UniProtKB/Swiss-Prot annotation, chain C:
Family: Belongs to the parvoviridae capsid protein family.
Reported biotechnological use: AAV capsids serve as viral gene transfer vectors that have been shown to affect long-term gene expression and disease correction with low toxicity in animal models, and are well tolerated in human clinical trials.
Other known facts: The ratio at which VP1, VP2 and VP3 proteins are synthesized in vivo is about 1:1:10, which is the same as in the mature virus particle.
Disulfide-bonded cysteines: none
Summary of the function given for this chain in its UniProt record: Capsid protein self-assembles to form an icosahedral capsid with a T=1 symmetry, about 22 nm in diameter, and consisting of 60 copies of three size variants of the capsid protein VP1, VP2 and VP3 which differ in their N-terminus. The capsid encapsulates the genomic ssDNA. Binds to host cell heparan sulfate and uses host ITGA5-ITGB1 as coreceptor on the cell surface to provide virion attachment to target cell. This attachment induces virion internalization predominantly through clathrin-dependent endocytosis.
Top-level taxonomic group: Viruses
Name of the protein this chain belongs to: Capsid protein VP1
Native organism: Adeno-associated virus 2 (isolate Srivastava/1982) (AAV-2)
Coiled-coil residues: none
Length: 511, 184, 61
């Protein structure tokens, strides 16, 4: 009924994208809600209380659904910043299939007019599942067909015990539009105005921002003893900040906030012989349940020379293609690493600095201590994390009064009103009912599943590059490898793969 | 969502007591193939939340109108070849429905029989069979006794892809009392 | 879970028609709705038969 659209057109300031996939929806839990909780495996920090439902929802939060590696490359080089504007959404071509096995023969008979029902909610009245970056995105590669993920959510509890504060929902309680074969569904959405993302990295570090030639007019304490006295020491002396002394020169703005992390080497010989990692493992907690700190405040991973060391937690660790689900060794997985924020934000492993302690006197020798943590303070600037490619797009600000600078910590655009979820469900069709009345709930049903196509379209808005720089740039380029193995392309047997993640910071602006 | 079997293989029946010697317990009545779905209970209409929210803030309440709509009708035919139970969908095979605003039939609801729309929307329920009683003595039925043939009314006919509506109105009736007095 | 409305038995004698399970006595309750499948005959006999033809095809909706 609709016309397949996968394509992108360049309008200049704005750029439109569209993609389309084929989806298949099973039927979950045989059409009945369930209470699910932890197995009570004695780990108190690990417990949950929640409900599984038959409802399916398909959720696109990741880039590679929308952008093809080419278009990614073409956008990432030429633009300072970009944000979405609207989006349009269209289902079409719905159809239903009924599987029935007579003896061992598995047979699939098409059917008509058996209905599927769908509803969105623009009112944000449901638990909001997306944003935890669960798998099940539209497949990277358009050829493949994917199943839709089951729904569910958690709630307040203690161990297996659930409080009286706990809530519950019955999703049928909303006005779901009904769909039958030959019918299509659309709704137009609008993104709220939100600051551009930053695609660039600065060309000059904070400490080095100054004029080399001219000496500023402030002084600083030079040396205590003239030499001597020594017992009488000597009167204070003063010198001026100059080309020779960069450290003493004075600065307006302070680097961003910090938090310590643990240093883990890739080389097992250097790493601590004994056991660590939860020895270990910087954490926070609620209600006596310690939550290991996953990717945290932005900060730089490593200094120049090491390159071997990496943070133990904050750095996102993706798996490669065909990766194992459990106990996989490093060589099968990709580590993302940020050396580009060295210009402002602190190094992760290192301390924030040293701070005065004692109040000195003649017999009292000065004492200091390494500061292990620093909160926000006036006159500070910092840079946001990179969005990569397979990384998430938008997350929802938790609806609350308390906020400070709502930037998600996986990177993305914090939205006050994210694109509403869409949920989808088959209509239960009863099996042969009993002849006489039965007080029973009638648990019999007919097995089936459906399929169709989904068209997602986003209209981006850009900011073009005005850069006046002289010498050549740095660009992203796949090259220098003569290997028979080609990147971003099917193997001989048709299994797609991604060589390495792709960060967004390539171009350059002065600070 | 509702599912309707076929009762008594499409034929009326006389049903009476087994005559188990208890004179106070006897009946004389007729079972029919007709199904009727009957909502008389609250929890069909109100969810416990809305119940709570209404029950606190209001002195009294009564209904005004009501609207009713069927839709999405479909038919299934089960046939067992040997032991294999098979269900083949069919088209244009018709279902027929009629109401009566004239109150010309025995009125079955009001005895609070089970078979309300299930409390919880997820479940799917069968529609209850019909039937009614009549004057009698033991097994004996008087000459005053009556009988009906329901086909004798103008039932509208429904076929797949057709829907049915009718609007009703409640007559003015005093509010119910939701409150209890503070002084004896 | 209690009942909603009940019908006043149509009669002359009345005193304050309030049902005893609680509810709203109506003079004209919401009409009942009745529903039935249309009987679809099985394979009929070739020659005439005076019988009522009790064969049918099983179905439900």
């Amino acid at each position: 009924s609709g016309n397949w659209h996968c394509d992108s057109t360049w309008m200049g300031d704005r750029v439109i994208t569209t993609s389309t996939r084929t989806w298949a929806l099973p039927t979950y839990n045989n059409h009945l809600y369930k209470q699910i909780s932890s197995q009570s495996g004695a780990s108190n920090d690990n417990h949950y209380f929640g409900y599984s439902t038959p409802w399916g929802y398909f959720d696109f939060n990741r880039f590679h659904c929308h952008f093809s590696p080419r278009d990614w490359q073409r956008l990432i080089n030429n633009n300072w910043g970009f944000r979405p504007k609207r989006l349009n959404f269209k289902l079409f071509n719905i159809q239903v299939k009924e599987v029935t096995q007579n003896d061992g023969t598995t047979t699939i008979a098409n059917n008509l007019t058996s209905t599927v029902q769908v509803f969105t909610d623009s009112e944000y009245q449901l638990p909001y599942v997306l944003g935890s970056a669960h798998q099940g995105c539209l497949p990277p590669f358009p050829a493949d067909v994917f199943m839709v993920p089951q729904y569910g959510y958690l709630t307040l509890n203690n161990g297996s015990q659930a409080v009286g504060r706990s809530s519950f929902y019955c999703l049928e309680y909303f006005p779901s539009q009904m769909l039958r074969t030959g019918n299509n569904f659309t709704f137009s959405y609008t993104f709220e105005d939100v600051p551009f993302h930053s695609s660039y990295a600065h060309s000059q570090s904070l400490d080095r921002l100054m004029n080399p030639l001219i000496d500023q007019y402030l002084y600083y304490l030079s040396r205590t003893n003239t030499p001597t006295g020594t017992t009488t020491q000597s009167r204070l002396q003063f010198s001026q900040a100059g080309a020779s002394d960069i450290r003493d020169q004075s600065r307006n703005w302070l680097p961003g906030p910090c938090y310590r992390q643990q240093r883990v080497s890739k080389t097992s010989a250097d790493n601590n012989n004994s056991e660590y990692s939860w020895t270990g493992a910087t954490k926070y907690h609620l209600n006596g349940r310690d939550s290991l700190v996953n990717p945290g405040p932005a900060m730089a991973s490593h200094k120049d020379d090491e390159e071997k060391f990496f943070p133990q937690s904050g750095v996102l660790i993706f798996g490669k293609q065909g990766s194992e689900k459990t106990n996989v060794d490093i060589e099968k997985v990709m580590i993302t690493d940020e050396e580009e924020i060295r210009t402002t934000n602190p190094v992760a492993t290192e301390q924030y600095g040293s701070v005065s302690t004692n109040l000195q006197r003649g017999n009292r020798q000065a004492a200091t201590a390494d500061v292990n943590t620093q909160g926000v303070l006036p006159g500070m600037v910092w840079q946001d994390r990179d969005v990569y490619l397979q990384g998430p797009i938008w997350a929802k600000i938790p609806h609350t009064d308390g906020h400070f600078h709502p930037s998600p910590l996986m990177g993305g655009f914090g939205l006050k009103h994210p694109p509403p979820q869409i949920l989808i469900k088959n209509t239960p069709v009863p099996a042969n009912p009993s002849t006489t009345f039965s007080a029973a709930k009638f648990a019999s049903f007919i097995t089936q599943y459906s399929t169709g196509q989904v068209s997602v379209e986003i209209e981006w808005e850009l900011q073009k590059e005005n850069s006046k720089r002289w010498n050549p740039e740095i660009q992203y380029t796949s090259n220098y490898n003569k290997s028979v193995n080609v990147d971003f392309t099917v193997d001989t047997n048709g299994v797609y793969s991604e060589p390495r993640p792709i960060g967004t910071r390539y171009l350059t602006r002065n600070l």
